[PDB]
């Protein structure tokens, strides 16, 4: 998508793994604000709306929480205390045709400053003098749709860094897309601590002899001590016994 039409796409209820993105051998000036880039995959947060653009890479450092300029004035603005990540990396081989890739024209003029996270779309030309333009372009019309010069012989500051906006907001909203959570193997017949799917604790973990309905995840008994669990990757039912203790 372009800067006039970067959509607020609601990709939800799936997983977008980020650990394959760090080993892409491509990322240049990636900076995840608020939270660290390392723990993006284990802990997640709601409002997982996504955006994309190839911004011209001369002023990537103008995009920051509380930093204005040209890109932060007329393209896309970040508010103070940003939770989320914008990842900038080059796109030299594919977003560069011969003779200039003029498939992404961009807004050069707006009357006011852009609101943070505002997708701006308009047709009308800039108002800078007092005389209105008659449709025919004159000396004070100032046609906002300028062309990025995207040629293969441009340098690294002139070539577009591709940016994706995985914006993170807080609402009364479902946390729909999170990263992957790794799992180890299963230990049996051992006084051991466990980290199952939601529930952790200590005990001796055995094979079962009971059965469940297809909707329970674990089970308790009289006076509510947890003595059962279901494992999620094996489709089996697993029992809990307390560890060996007593007096001497």
């Amino acid at each position: 998508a372009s800067v006039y039409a970067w959509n607020r796409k609601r990709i939800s209820n799936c997983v977008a793994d980020y650990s394959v993105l760090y080993n892409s051998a491509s990322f240049s000036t990636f900076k995840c604000y608020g939270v660290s880039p390392t723990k993006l995959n284990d802990l997640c947060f709601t409002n997982v709306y996504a955006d994309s653009f190839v911004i011209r890479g001369d002023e990537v450092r103008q995009i920051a929480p509380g930093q204005t300029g040209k890109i932060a004035d007329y393209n896309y603005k970040l508010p103070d205390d940003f939770t989320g990540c914008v990842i900038a990396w080059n796109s030299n081989n594919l977003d560069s045709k011969v003779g200039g890739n003029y498939n992404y024209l961009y807004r050069l003029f707006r009357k006011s400053n852009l609101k943070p996270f505002e997708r701006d779309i308009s047709t009308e030309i800039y108002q800078a003098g007092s005389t209105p333009c008659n449709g025919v372009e004159g000396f004070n019309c100032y046609f906002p749709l300028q062309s990025y010069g995207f040629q293969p012989t441009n340098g690294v500051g002139y070539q577009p860094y591709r940016v994706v906006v995985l914006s993170f907001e807080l609402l009364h909203a479902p946390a729909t897309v999170c990263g992957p959570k790794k799992s180890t193997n299963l230990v049996k017949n051992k006084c051991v601590n466990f980290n199952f799917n939601g529930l952790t604790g200590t005990g001796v973990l055995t094979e079962s002899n009971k059965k469940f309905l297809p909707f329970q995840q674990f089970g308790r008994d009289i006076a509510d001590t947890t003595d059962a669990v279901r494992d999620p990757q094996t489709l089996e039912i697993l029992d809990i016994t307390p560890c060996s203790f007593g007096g001497v």
């Binding site: 040209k70 004035d73 011969v98 200039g100 003029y102 050069l108 062309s147 010069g149 040629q151 012989t153």
Partner: protein, 114 residues
């Protein structure tokens, strides 16, 4: 506060040479990237040459490599644009560009090659 003007235009024939300039005020060109764009009749605006802000690497587009040369002077705060080996495809209106806070577009110069 940034004012850009263009000078050094004229009319040449096939096989001529010319020299353009862009005098600047209010910003240093050794801290920002200077670019040049042209505008031919019947065509859209396209980039000609640029100098990076470090001043080390200069770049030219696909049809204008090997013949054109852009150079800068830090003391006069003016960037010079050299024409060599001119063809009638280069008949255009030339502008200099910089992004210092906002973008500033000059009045341009006229270069006619025939």
């Amino acid at each position: 506060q940034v004012q850009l003007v263009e000078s050094g235009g004229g009319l040449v024939q096939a096989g001529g040479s010319l020299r353009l300039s862009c005098a600047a005020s209010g910003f240093p060109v050794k801290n920002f990237e200077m670019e040049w764009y042209r505008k031919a009749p019947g065509k859209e605006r396209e980039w000609v040459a640029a100098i990076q802000s470090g001043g080390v690497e200069t770049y030219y587009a696909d049809s204008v490599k090997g013949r054109f040369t852009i150079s800068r002077d830090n003391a006069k705060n003016t960037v010079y644009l050299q024409m060599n080996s001119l063809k009638p495809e280069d008949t255009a209106v030339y502008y200099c560009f910089v992004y210092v806070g906002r973008s500033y577009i000059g009045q341009g110069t006229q270069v006619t090659v025939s």
